[PDB]
Design an enzyme around this catalytic site. Structure first.
Site, PDB file in Angstrom:
ATOM      1  N   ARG A 186       1.284  -1.408  -0.150  1.00 39.71           N
ATOM      2  CA  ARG A 186      -0.328   0.024  -0.108  1.00 39.71           C
ATOM      3  C   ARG A 186       0.908   0.808   0.216  1.00 39.71           C
ATOM      4  NH1 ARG A 186      -2.737   2.759   4.989  1.00 39.71           N
ATOM      5  NH2 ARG A 186      -4.484   4.370   3.200  1.00 39.71           N
ATOM      6  N   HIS A 232       0.491   4.412  -3.018  1.00 42.06           N
ATOM      7  CA  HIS A 232       0.636   5.275  -2.566  1.00 42.06           C
ATOM      8  C   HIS A 232       1.207   6.367  -2.543  1.00 42.06           C
ATOM      9  CE1 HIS A 232      -3.156   5.092   0.544  1.00 42.06           C
ATOM     10  NE2 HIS A 232      -3.300   4.651  -0.131  1.00 42.06           N
ATOM     11  N   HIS A 254      -6.110  -6.025  -3.239  1.00 42.64           N
ATOM     12  CA  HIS A 254      -7.525  -5.466  -2.127  1.00 42.64           C
ATOM     13  C   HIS A 254      -7.013  -7.623  -1.467  1.00 42.64           C
ATOM     14  CE1 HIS A 254      -8.768  -1.393  -1.665  1.00 42.64           C
ATOM     15  NE2 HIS A 254      -7.374  -1.654  -1.886  1.00 42.64           N
ATOM     16  N   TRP A 259     -10.199  -8.887   3.440  1.00 39.15           N
ATOM     17  CA  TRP A 259     -10.991  -8.815   2.518  1.00 39.15           C
ATOM     18  C   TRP A 259     -11.242 -10.689   1.679  1.00 39.15           C
ATOM     19  CZ3 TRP A 259     -10.644  -3.725   0.544  1.00 39.15           C
ATOM     20  CH2 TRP A 259      -9.662  -3.368   0.842  1.00 39.15           C
TER      21      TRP A 259
HETATM   22  C1  HEM Z   1      -9.695   3.352  -6.226  1.00 39.57           C
HETATM   23  C2  HEM Z   1      -8.646   2.288  -6.364  1.00 39.57           C
HETATM   24  C3  HEM Z   1      -8.080   2.783  -4.207  1.00 39.57           C
HETATM   25  C4  HEM Z   1      -9.380   3.053  -2.918  1.00 39.57           C
HETATM   26  C5  HEM Z   1     -10.055   4.005  -2.883  1.00 39.57           C
HETATM   27  C6  HEM Z   1      -8.309   2.131  -2.290  1.00 39.57           C
HETATM   28  C7  HEM Z   1      -8.505   2.253  -0.942  1.00 39.57           C
HETATM   29  C8  HEM Z   1      -8.223   1.063   0.644  1.00 39.57           C
HETATM   30  C9  HEM Z   1      -8.474   1.591   1.457  1.00 39.57           C
HETATM   31  C10 HEM Z   1      -9.993   2.750   2.153  1.00 39.57           C
HETATM   32  C11 HEM Z   1      -7.741   0.176   2.615  1.00 39.57           C
HETATM   33  C12 HEM Z   1      -7.825   0.425   3.890  1.00 39.57           C
HETATM   34  C13 HEM Z   1      -6.794   1.162   4.736  1.00 39.57           C
HETATM   35  C14 HEM Z   1      -6.529   1.198   6.335  1.00 39.57           C
HETATM   36  O1  HEM Z   1      -7.687   0.909   6.921  1.00 39.57           O
HETATM   37  O2  HEM Z   1      -5.747   0.582   7.099  1.00 39.57           O
HETATM   38  C15 HEM Z   1      -7.557   0.429   1.523  1.00 39.57           C
HETATM   39  C16 HEM Z   1      -6.245  -1.118   1.637  1.00 39.57           C
HETATM   40  C17 HEM Z   1      -5.145  -1.719   0.190  1.00 39.57           C
HETATM   41  N1  HEM Z   1      -5.136  -0.989  -0.337  1.00 39.57           N
HETATM   42 FE1  HEM Z   1      -6.106   0.239  -1.232  1.00 39.57          FE
HETATM   43  N2  HEM Z   1      -7.405   1.400  -2.489  1.00 39.57           N
HETATM   44  C18 HEM Z   1      -7.196   1.402  -4.055  1.00 39.57           C
HETATM   45  C19 HEM Z   1      -6.342   0.899  -4.473  1.00 39.57           C
HETATM   46  C20 HEM Z   1      -5.441   0.236  -4.458  1.00 39.57           C
HETATM   47  C21 HEM Z   1      -4.526  -0.369  -4.931  1.00 39.57           C
HETATM   48  C22 HEM Z   1      -4.101  -0.269  -7.012  1.00 39.57           C
HETATM   49  C23 HEM Z   1      -3.462  -0.887  -4.538  1.00 39.57           C
HETATM   50  C24 HEM Z   1      -2.211  -1.793  -5.144  1.00 39.57           C
HETATM   51  C25 HEM Z   1      -1.816  -1.593  -6.023  1.00 39.57           C
HETATM   52  C26 HEM Z   1      -4.298  -1.411  -3.985  1.00 39.57           C
HETATM   53  C27 HEM Z   1      -3.640  -1.660  -1.599  1.00 39.57           C
HETATM   54  C28 HEM Z   1      -4.098  -1.993  -1.019  1.00 39.57           C
HETATM   55  C29 HEM Z   1      -3.505  -2.729   0.450  1.00 39.57           C
HETATM   56  C30 HEM Z   1      -2.761  -3.899   0.015  1.00 39.57           C
HETATM   57  C31 HEM Z   1      -4.391  -2.416   1.048  1.00 39.57           C
HETATM   58  C32 HEM Z   1      -4.182  -2.983   2.674  1.00 39.57           C
HETATM   59  C33 HEM Z   1      -3.305  -2.058   3.500  1.00 39.57           C
HETATM   60  C34 HEM Z   1      -3.280  -3.123   4.785  1.00 39.57           C
HETATM   61  O3  HEM Z   1      -3.210  -4.161   5.274  1.00 39.57           O
HETATM   62  O4  HEM Z   1      -3.148  -2.057   6.439  1.00 39.57           O
HETATM   63  N3  HEM Z   1      -4.843  -0.521  -3.047  1.00 39.57           N
HETATM   64  N4  HEM Z   1      -7.639   0.559   0.268  1.00 39.57           N
END
Ligand code: HEM
EC number: 1.11.1.5
Length: 291
Positions: free
Chosen positions: A45, A49, A172, A188
């Site tokens: 993540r 970002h 995700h 997820w």
């Molecule tokens: C429209 C696209 C996206 C939105 C709105 C979005 C939003 C989010 C949100 C709300 C979280 C949870 C954060 C938390 O509370 O810790 C999250 C987690 C995560 N996202 Fe996304 N995401 C998007 C795209 C992506 C993409 C393109 C990647 C990677 C190539 C990605 C990878 C991750 C990963 C690995 C997590 C887990 C993080 C953790 O376990 O702490 N996301 N995302």
């Protein structure tokens, strides 16, 4: 803006393979973070970002300048919880002081995916730390409470097409949402620190219910105890996105191939590479080195 890649002076493939080895060995070691999920998920993540701030119109933002290191970007509401990925990488930067921040932050994502049994991601070195006044303003990263039309339009600023958006969103399956970071809560799926096509299978096979959570946001909750965001749910409400979800649900190797291409493009956006520059490196895993 032009941002030309510049190799850290005198470094070769073997130097970068040592920074990869140090990140992978510390992933192995700190396996207890976030109820035993490990730091793999928050590191991919962080890499998305620092890359996702890019604007194709004026070449601002993106991974090149390593600007997450500065207060404005570091304290961006959308970045809440990434301070744990930063803190993880900081001892590694004290040990290899020559690597630039953008190269470290982006290679962390690459190391995380490969050590979680993901595909091999080619990586290029050469990002250069740029000054605090090049730090992008907050608000360029995407909201979760929206639909497939918002998603298509957002990823057009990074010029990702449909197939690249669906492959990228397959990350995700990793990690989870945390109420205190984003106002959403839940995992997820079941295998959240091994890289698989699980995201697509759950989106097509689970009985999903729309509900409000304790932050007053909507999310899609399943009987199995898994969750997904409105923006994830979008990918089966749109007919073009939906045929690609199906494709990855039936073929995880096709998904690994397309995720690999799209994640390297995401990490390289906004960066010009001279052809005297080295080819992209393919790093060996700990297991391939017997370590
Ligand atoms: C429209 C696209 C996206 C939105 C709105 C979005 C939003 C989010 C949100 C709300 C979280 C949870 C954060 C938390 O509370 O810790 C999250 C987690 C995560 N996202 Fe996304 N995401 C998007 C795209 C992506 C993409 C393109 C990647 C990677 C190539 C990605 C990878 C991750 C990963 C690995 C997590 C887990 C993080 C953790 O376990 O702490 N996301 N995302």
């Amino acid at each position: 803006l032009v941002h030309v890649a510049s190799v850290e002076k005198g470094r070769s493939y073997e130097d970068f393979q040592k920074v990869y080895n140090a990140i992978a060995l510390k992933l192995r070691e700190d396996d207890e973070y976030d109820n035993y999920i490990g730091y793999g998920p928050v590191l991919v993540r962080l890499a998305w970002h620092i890359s996702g701030t890019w604007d194709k119109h004026d070449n601002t933002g993106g991974s090149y300048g390593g600007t997450y290191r500065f207060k404005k970007e570091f304290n961006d509401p959308s970045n809440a919880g990434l301070q744990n990925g930063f803190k993880f990488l900081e001892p590694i930067h004290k040990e290899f002081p020559w690597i630039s921040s953008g190269d470290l932050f982006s290679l962390g994502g690459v190391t995380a995916v490969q050590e979680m049994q993901g595909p091999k991601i080619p990586w290029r070195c050469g990002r250069v730390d740029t000054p605090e006044d090049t730090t992008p303003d907050n608000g360029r990263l995407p909201d979760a409470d929206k639909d497939a039309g918002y998603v298509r339009t957002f990823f057009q600023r990074l010029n990702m097409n449909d197939r690249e958006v669906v492959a990228l969103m397959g990350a995700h399956a990793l990690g989870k949402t945390h109420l205190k970071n984003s106002g959403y809560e839940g995992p997820w799926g079941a295998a959240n620190n091994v890289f698989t096509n699980e995201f697509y299978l759950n989106l097509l096979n689970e009985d999903w219910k729309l509900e409000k959570n304790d932050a007053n946001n909507e999310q899609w909750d399943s009987k199995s105890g898994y969750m997904h965001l409105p923006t994830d749910y979008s990918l089966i409400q749109d007919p073009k996105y939906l045929s690609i979800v199906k494709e990855y649900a039936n073929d995880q190797d096709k998904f690994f191939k397309d995720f690999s291409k799209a994640f390297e493009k995401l990490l390289e956006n906004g960066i010009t590479f001279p052809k005297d520059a080295p080819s992209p490196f393919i790093f060996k895993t700990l297991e391939e080195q017997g370590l």
